Design a protein around this ligand. Structure first.
Ligand SMILES: N[C@@H](Cc1c[nH]c[nH+]1)C(=O)O
Ligand SMILES: [Fe+3]
Ligand code: NA
Length: 449
């Protein structure tokens, strides 16, 4: 699991190598990426994700000073502003920043090893490693947005071998009743650092009288979404909401990521789609691969999903509806953090930056939920209808900006993404994304009206 020095130390090394492979694989000319509201300079993410260790572990527990105190405000995500991260005068070189990382990674490992494994240190150990892995995803989707080559550790072609399409397709009517949502608060549990670990957005736990509903056991596929495109949905202003219709009227460079000159216009299909000689294609980092039909529709907005749900007479689930259909945890019963149980097998889901969402929607049957819903935890951040809002009883974490900057404006997505790492995923997990975003690995399944 994640209660072992070994597991932590292995996770720390896996993460550092992920970051290292992400930044060294780039050419010096590529380290300064094209500006985009959702991307960040990769060397900065390496430094920033390393500073978190110094702040919320090394200095937090031992008072250890910073490696270079001069950068203690330039690595901070709250203090530093997005546009000023593309400086090349304020920030050290990829070579010097790599040393900074490797030094702090060693300091981290040394403390994990040569200092007591208090529940406090464990909670902080995991929080920090996870935060770096949250940036492994950011750096990975930066490459997709700016059109850089795929990360070395990735297999973006996807599960081509297990290309399949079982009869699992269908909605699962879920039994009504009282279900348990979320994780216990850290003060109310002596396992806050172990079996009850979660971020502030997942706490405090609560119960819900849930009416029965039917949710598709399968994610919406490229082919299913194709019909909505072919039927002119993006031009039918009826299936789109007020914000959806405003999002439809945006004028954006539809050629961002493509090495082709800027082309300003309105979106008529998923941003990363393009029809070539009648065949639908999809940009996969530096290549335009054919859009396989049984693969999930990915990198689409909440409005694109909203419109599809209306055009299909279906609905988006709520995040509570989602969690009960994923873990089916009921108050007083034994609970599970994963739809398959409480032990994590990286093989039961498309995560850890590998198949990159190009998996048959009806794959990973071992990660099936109690209700038969497949590929819930992972593949693509599934849009929900609820707005990211604090659970009643919210308490900020030691990192108080984990959720407080993304309330109301953002929508709750659940599950996990091809670019997100498996050590941090949980059914209770909540990831906020702005509903206008098409740069993140988002998808959706549909409920029944
Ligand atoms: N809530 C923050 C958490 C985070 C910090 N760094 C990366 N991610 C976010 O989703 O962006
Ligand atoms: Fe961060
Ligand atoms: Na998912």
């Amino acid at each position: 699991h994640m209660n072992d020095r070994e597991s932590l130390i292995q996770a720390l090394h896996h993460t550092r190598d992920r970051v290292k492979d992400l930044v060294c694989s780039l050419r010096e000319d590529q380290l300064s990426v094209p500006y985009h509201p959702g991307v960040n300079p990769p060397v900065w993410e390496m430094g920033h994700s390393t500073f978190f260790y110094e702040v919320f572990v090394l200095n937090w527990l031992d008072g250890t000073p910073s490696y270079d105190p001069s950068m203690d405000d330039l690595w901070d995500s709250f203090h530093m502003d997005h546009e000023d991260r593309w400086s090349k005068t304020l920030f050290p070189s990829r070579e010097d920043t790599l040393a900074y990382m490797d030094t702090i990674i060693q300091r981290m490992e040394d403390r994990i090893r040569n200092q007591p494994l208090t529940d406090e240190a464990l909670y902080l150990y995991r929080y920090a490693i996870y935060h770096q892995n949250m940036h492994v995803e950011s750096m990975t989707w930066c490459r997709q947005t700016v059109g850089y080559p795929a990360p070395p550790f990735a297999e973006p072609k996807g599960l081509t071998g297990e290309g399949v399409d079982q009869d699992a397709r269908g909605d699962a009517t879920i039994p009504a009743g009282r279900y348990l949502i979320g994780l216990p608060a850290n003060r109310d549990s002596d396992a806050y650092a172990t079996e009850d670990f979660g971020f502030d957005n997942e706490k405090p736990a609560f119960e819900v009288d849930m009416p029965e509903f039917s949710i598709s056991r399968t994610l919406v596929t490229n082919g299913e979404f194709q019909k909505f495109v072919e039927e002119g949905g993006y031009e039918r202003p009826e299936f789109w909401s007020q914000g959806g219709r405003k999002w439809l009227e945006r004028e954006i460079n539809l050629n961002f990521g493509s090495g082709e000159p800027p082309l300003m216009g309105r979106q008529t299909h998923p941003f990363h789609w393009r029809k070539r000689d009648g065949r639908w294609y999809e940009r996969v980092f530096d290549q335009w691969l054919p859009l396989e039909p049984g693969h999930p529709v990915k990198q689409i907005s909440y409005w694109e999903a909203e419109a599809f749900c209306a055009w299909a007479g279906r609905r988006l689930p709520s995040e509570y509806e989602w969690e009960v259909a994923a873990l089916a945890n009921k108050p007083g019963e034994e609970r599970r953090r994963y739809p398959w149980g409480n032990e994590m097998d990286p093989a039961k889901l498309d995560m850890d930056q590998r198949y990159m969402g190009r998996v048959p929607v009806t794959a990973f049957p071992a990660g099936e939920s109690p209700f038969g819903c497949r590929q819930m935890l992972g593949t693509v951040w599934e849009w929900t209808g609820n707005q990211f809002m604090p659970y009643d009883g919210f308490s900020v974490d030691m990192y108080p900006f984990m959720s407080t900057l993304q309330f109301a404006t953002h929508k709750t997505t659940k599950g996990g993404g091809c670019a997100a790492s498996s050590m941090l995923i949980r059914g209770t997990y909540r990831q906020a994304y702005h509903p206008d975003r098409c740069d993140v690995y988002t998808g959706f399944r549909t409920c029944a009206l």
